[PDB]
Structure formats: structure tokens, C-alpha cells
């Protein structure tokens, strides 16, 4: 029906994402939240008949700040999707009360999910804002410049355009789906 592409011509296969990921993502992370706390979870999923279906939501063990987040226990993490066949098909993180956007640390980190994965999805939330995006590294051109950038800090400008809105809904479809939210901390 609807196709998405990356900008190197490469076909994406759709995601389906359970309308409900969002809200009960932002209410299992909502003490941090309140904390003006950044939290990330994990979109974890199947493939079948050449579509990927989120099926689990993972908040990891992790350690945050105001404009950071970050898995410290990499193992359960790992243990968990093992467990259970679950591909990484993105992830999911709040700004608290910034605007939503990918920051420099968002970008890069970005990159090692869409390096495994060329759907690999970054679902960012404001939900001090009531606003939400979910985002992908240009490809190839994004993907290039973050790998190539070794400029220090965690809050460094990139040269060119590096990034963009997912096509919905042609690359993610948010649909009726079944949801499992696990919570390893
Ligand atoms: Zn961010
Ligand atoms: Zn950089």
C-alpha cells in the first residue's frame, strides 16, 4: 500500500507500534518525569511477513540526568530480549521539558540502532509540552556524519542535516496491537 525509503533508495519495512506504547511509557516513567529526570525504554518486537511488530516495551536498568539517559546494566537488558526472541526495533526517551527533537547524545546514540537496524526508530517525548516525534538518521548522509564526528562534549553542533521524521504511515504505523511493558529496574 505505502512504501517509505531511505534517501540511498534502500526499502523500509513498516513498524507497527500499539497505539498505547506512548501514554503508558510517559506514566511508568512519570516519577522520573517529575524529577525532571530523562527516562529511556527499549522498543522490542518479531518480525512476520516482512513487517516488525513492537510487542514489548523494556525500561532498563539505567542512569539519567536532566538531558540524559543511559542502559548501566546492558546484561538483563540482553538477558530479557534473549529470553524471549525479541529484535531491537528502537527506542523511547523524554525530554522533560524541552521541546521534542534529537539532541547531539540522542543522534549518536541513535546511530548504533539504526547501524543494526535500517528501521531502527527513536520515539522522543515532551510531555511538558503535550508534543512527541519519532525520528531517524538521514541514510546514508546522517548515519556518515555521526560515525565520522569526533568532536568532544556531550552537547557538540553537527554540520549538515543528519536527521528527520519517520514517514508515518509508511514506515510506522501506529495501530491496535498488544503490549507488554517490562520494567527491569
Ligand atoms: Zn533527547
Ligand atoms: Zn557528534
Known sequence: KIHAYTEGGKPLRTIYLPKLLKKVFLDVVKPNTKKNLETCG????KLRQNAFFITHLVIPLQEA????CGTTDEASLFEFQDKHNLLTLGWIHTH???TCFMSSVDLHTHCSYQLMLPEAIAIVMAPSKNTSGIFR???????????????PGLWH??????????????????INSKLQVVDLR
Open 96 to 98: 522533560p521539558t524541552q
Open 157 to 174: 553542533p553537527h554540520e549538515g542535516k543528519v536527521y528527520t521524521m519517520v514517514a508515518q504511515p509508511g514506515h510506522v504505523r501506529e
Open 65 to 68: 540526568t536532566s538531558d540524559t
Open 137 to 151: 538518521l538521514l541514510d546514508p548522509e546522517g548515519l556518515q556524519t555521526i560515525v565520522k564526528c569526533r568532536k
Open 42 to 45: 527499549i522498543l522490542c518486537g
